[PDB]
Amino acid sequence: PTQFEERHLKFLQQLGKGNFGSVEMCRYDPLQDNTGEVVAVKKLQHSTEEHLRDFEREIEILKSLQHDNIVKYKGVCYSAGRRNLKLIMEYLPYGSLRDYLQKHKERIDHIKLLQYTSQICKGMEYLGTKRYIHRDLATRNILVENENRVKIGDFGLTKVLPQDKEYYKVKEPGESPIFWYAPESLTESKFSVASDVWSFGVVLYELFTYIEKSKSPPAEFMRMIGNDKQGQSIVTHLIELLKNNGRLPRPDGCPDEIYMIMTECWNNNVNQRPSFRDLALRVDQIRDNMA
């Protein structure tokens, strides 16, 4: 069932590419008659021992997850051995929520945005039960199954909390999604349920801007940082801005109670951010009040 042989994988098209790995749309066709299931397949380009260990950890996390709002794991292809593993996930033709929302915004009202928001909270609450910190919550990493269902994707950075600590410190982090990071993640590389809640605030911001390009978190933070950037890195300007209570502005058209939720997620103190359970409850009630 979870056994996939390289000889039966047929390349259909490219679906994405990072700095060290990529995603392809393949058909898994053991009958060789083109009736096989279409799947999304991840592989690494530059396979260093550390990238390999991270990839194996991503696969172990995916094997453990079964939820309606989490992308379905199918298996792994071990044909070329440990050095060239391939991860097999369900293929979702609607793609990312970031792209789907930009494409279908004329048929996606605030009530629909809140239905997606609730599903994301539910998926996140489930991750929390397993002590998993997603670390890359963003609309580009949430996938769409249909008009009524979204699923949390890209578990490439997901970490498991230590048994006795409420945070995981990442010893050696590569290129990071800084405009979605909590301040303690930027300054101390500390990741927790509370830093996933901060990122969730940024996701909610993305949704309510309807992915208007000029309003993206990098566009707004870069404008807020200003023109006079001499002497310090962008991460340094970002750390200072957030310490001085600089925040993404309220999208025009955004309900006040939704912006209030974002501002609470963006508390500088890890211990003062809302829980995903409370976020689901609040979002569900705002959505019920709208209709």
Ligand X SMILES: CCc1cc(O)c(F)cc1-c1ccc2c(-c3nc4c([nH]3)CN(C(=O)c3cnc(N5CCCCC5)cn3)CC4)[nH]nc2c1
Nearer to ligand X, 87 or 124 (CB): 87
Any known ligand binding at 128? Answer: no
Question: Does 87 participate in binding ligand X (rule CB under 6 A)?
Answer: yes
Which region, judged by CB under 6 A, interacts with ligand X, from 4-12, 15-23, 209-217, 261-269? 15-23
Nearer to ligand X, 154 or 206 (CB): 154
Confirm if 225 and 237 have CB atoms less than 8 A apart: yes
Q: Which two tokens stand for residue 126?
A: 């489930």
Confirm if 146 and 95 have CB atoms less than 8 A apart: no
> Which of 2, 14, 48, 187 touches ligand X by CB under 6 A?
14
Question: Does 40 participate in binding ligand X (rule CB under 6 A)?
Answer: yes
Question: Does 204 participate in binding ligand X (rule CB under 6 A)?
Answer: no
Smallest CA-to-CA distance from 61 within 195, 152, 122 is with 152
Smallest CA-to-CA distance from 112 within 214, 210, 250, 211 is with 210
Q: Which two tokens stand for residue 228?
A: 């006079």
Q: Which residue is nearest to ligand X (CB)?
A: 95
Residue ranges of the alpha helices (H) in the chain? 49-64, 97-104, 110-129, 183-188, 193-208, 217-225, 234-243, 256-265, 276-290
Smallest CA-to-CA distance from 220 within 111, 39, 120, 208 is with 208
Which strands, in side-by-side order, build the sheet including 9-17? 9-17, 21-28, 37-44, 86-90, 73-77
Angle among Cα 39, 45, 51 to the nearest 5 degrees reads 95
> Which of 20, 51, 52, 58 touches ligand X by CB under 6 A?
58
> Which of 12, 15, 178, 224 touches ligand X by CB under 6 A?
15
Which region, judged by CB under 6 A, interacts with ligand X, from 86-94, 159-167, 252-260, 272-280? 86-94
Question: Does 145 participate in binding ligand X (rule CB under 6 A)?
Answer: no
Question: Does 95 participate in binding ligand X (rule CB under 6 A)?
Answer: yes
Size of the site for ligand X (CB under 6 A): 22
Any known ligand binding at 36? Answer: no
Question: Does 156 participate in binding ligand X (rule CB under 6 A)?
Answer: yes
Nearer to ligand X, 155 or 198 (CB): 155
Rounded to whole angstroms, what are the CA distances from 249 to 71, 179, 188, 197, 200? 31, 14, 25, 18, 16
Question: Does 17 participate in binding ligand X (rule CB under 6 A)?
Answer: yes
Question: Does 23 participate in binding ligand X (rule CB under 6 A)?
Answer: yes
Nearer to ligand X, 12 or 161 (CB): 12
Question: Does 155 participate in binding ligand X (rule CB under 6 A)?
Answer: yes
Q: Which residues are catalytic?
A: 136
Smallest CA-to-CA distance from 177 within 214, 144, 206 is with 206
Any known ligand binding at 22? Answer: yes
Nearer to ligand X, 91 or 116 (CB): 91
Cα 208 to Cα 31: distance, rounded to the nearest angstrom: 46
Nearer to ligand X, 135 or 190 (CB): 135
Question: Does 173 participate in binding ligand X (rule CB under 6 A)?
Answer: no
Annotated binding-site members for ATP: 15-23, 42
Q: Binding site, residues?
A: 15-23, 42
Residues that bind ligand X (CB under 6 A): 14-17, 23, 40, 42, 58, 62, 71, 87, 89-93, 95, 143, 153-156
